[PDB]
Symmetry: D2
Subunit: 257 residues, 4 copies
């Protein structure tokens, strides 16, 4: 079947990539970066992120695989020393699939939609900003501070975590909202976990210019009227060869490897 490989770009990553391609040449494996059924990423979690967005239009037909040439990553959870084993199993393996929930973000002006593997955040064009938070068409609070972060289950170990967010198992179809330096003299303060059909809307009070980020991409949006968040209907599919539990991955990254 078809496959492609992205590389962090350093010596270690390019060489690992050139070798896997060689091993793939020993099997019925056509390299194709247009319609790959398998996407292998070599480097770190950031390299994986870029690979996700590069192919975010054929997600339902792709199985992703993350190799870390550096520190152990949440998405890049395979060691380089297992690259050749991957080649073999990927070839004639009926390997299983693991799917994670994604975050849908909608921006409206006076619509643009995006998909996020980790999170989407909103901040001001300088200084603290003010937006109204509407949950399912009901006003929930008026937020003033640095910004807000809406996170996927797998993205909870990222930006979410730094903002006091909870770590959530990716088998749970949900999204989590956290605050950035909220001034309270009135917000909920606590992070909020939303289910599959709940819609969270952010609306401008005075200023209509915001810095909106989706994972690594950061876009200054002008004359914005609304920002809508909801658990996407699309999912990211991983190739599963062995058992590497999420909590073990949490333990190795933050407690001790």
């Amino acid at each position: 079947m078809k496959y492609m490989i992205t590389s962090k770009g350093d010596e270690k990553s390019d060489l690992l990539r050139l070798n896997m391609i060689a091993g793939f040449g020993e099997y019925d494996m056509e390299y194709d970066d247009v319609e790959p059924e398998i996407v292998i990423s070599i480097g770190g979690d950031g390299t994986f992120l870029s690979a996700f967005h590069q192919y975010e239009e054929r997600l339902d037909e792709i199985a992703f695989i993350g190799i870390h040439t550096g520190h152990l990553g949440f998405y890049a959870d395979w060691r380089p020393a297992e690259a050749d084993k991957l080649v073999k199993l990927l070839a004639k393996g009926e390997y299983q699939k693991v799917s994670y929930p994604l975050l849908k973000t909608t921006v409206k002006y006076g619509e643009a939609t995006y998909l996020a593997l980790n999170e989407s955040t909103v901040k001001s064009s300088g200084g603290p900003f003010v937006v109204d938070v509407v949950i399912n068409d009901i006003h929930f609070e008026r937020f003033r501070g640095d910004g807000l972060c809406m996170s996927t289950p797998s993205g909870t170990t990222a930006y979410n975590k730094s903002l006091g967010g909870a770590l959530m198992h990716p088998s749970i179809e949900a999204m989590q909202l956290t605050e950035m330096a909220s001034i309270n003299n009135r917000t909920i303060g606590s992070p909020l976990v939303f289910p599959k059909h709940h819609v969270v809307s952010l609306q401008p009070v005075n200023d209509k210019d915001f810095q909106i980020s989706v994972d690594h991409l950061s876009i200054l949006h002008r004359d914005v009227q609304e920002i809508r968040y909801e658990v996407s209907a699309k999912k990211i599919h991983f190739a599963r060869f062995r058992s590497f539990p999420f909590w073990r991955r949490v333990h190795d990254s933050f407690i001790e490897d």
Copy 2:
């Protein structure tokens, strides 16, 4: 059908109770506190809690209803001025049912099981304590501090919330673990959200005596070997007459009513 009514015990609650019983006398409604199909609680969230545990053996056959004679409660979400309307609909209504997840706690010595509507916590017999946290048979961390809290979705607005926990919609079948004054000089720090089949086990290191609480009940357990948490298979059923969304209930309690 059969029904019963518990009261906070003050003048306001007893009188509201005596009136509802009277209204129920105008319908085919046999009062029975042994096998009630309807359990109405009058007072606060604490009164509701006591009512839950009083009938925790017939949960699958009971529909609960909470009336608040004081401040608006998360479980007691009906105003007294609507008591008579409840009577009528409860009589000849095909009212819907809303179910919330519960927490199963297991204690083993050298087994006792309990159900919690809000949370279960563990603390020491004085001073900071030490326990090993095992997630699905894999050691996750060694905790030293004041204690730990395992919370249901609806219980996240309670003790969980004070410990930095996230607020979680009760339609999500999950449990959340938070820390109490963890010493870090090594824990995850972040709250953890577990799904339906994950098992979290707490194990003694040196001392085998702990103060274990399940909602309002607090029991000093001696010679404890293990404390196991998991999302219960049982659920609490509410009677649904109107629409009072969880996030609206969150807003009214913490933001402004």
Copy 3:
């Protein structure tokens, strides 16, 4: 003696200002916005801030006074209804003086100094940034995240407070440092309180461009080599007529007025 008055600029503030000037015309009080010995601010805490920086070169010769025409402020702690009483006492009163510590910030390139009443912060030109934190010439930590905040005692109720900082009585000559979304996978996490002669230095790792803020003024600094913080030798002097304790002011703003 000489005095001046700044106004928030709305109807309420301008009229209060025109009246106080009139009352001052009934006494030996020459209006002078060049060398005033008394600076009265009318509006909010922000109006007071602007007044501080407008005269930050004659701080040792000025006594400040804050009037709030809106909500009670930490610096603007006089009600409009007491404006005329201020006029009288300011005229022939041997009123006392209350002084608060200030923050000195130094920026070096490849020097510019500033004074802050509230705080100074540093952030990146987009995304998370990395700087080395040196305390008294000894490397303390390498910070990665959104930014850092160095705060004066009186500024602890402001931005500091939102970042988890402690509230510190302004009679204590100190500065407090807090983190903004630190990634920990290694920082202290806890806020840090420094005494009068300690010097905290921030140094660029890869990028030399930062957004540096001093109170309300925000300046993008390029080719920065070092940012030095220390408790200033200069102090801001207030005119004291009555007793309005700091903790009472804290209580009224955050607990209930």
Copy 4:
């Protein structure tokens, strides 16, 4: 001069102690655990704590010294391999003295005073408790939760730190108050830093029984009417031989040694 030595009690500590005593026998050094002018502690920070309280009545005449046979401690900041060097300098050295602020706690019934090197805390006889917090005779807030902690500057790296407290340089004469699981549905939330003459009083609302702790000692106090905190007039004196800065000590304990 007179001196004494306390030991953690294990093999390593007793032997280090027997050797130092021997070295002291080679100088004019009379061992006396009644009126020692020098108190050497061998073990950890806890061993030092016990040594502080054992001699809390002759603090003004004693110079303390902490040796760690285990991990580096904040009070026990000398390595065993430097024990003999200590002996020599302690003998004929005009060594300097370093003094840290202490916390005075007063309990009144229907008075008992105590001194704390680290902190004093108050908790309930089971479950959440309620007390009124009065700052300098002015009601500040009504607290409901697990408890409160009043901490010295050097004690901020201890229990304080786990409760979100700030780390404060011990040259600052102050005390810091932190909350334990405060329910907010109304407290300040932020830690509070008080100066030398401020008095913080805790007063019972309904229940008059509390668990009061001073460092390691924990006493259930019955029929308590008031608990008063203030920066003590007494100070603990250390012997200073070399330069081991507080922030370096913070870095080595929490960042990396």
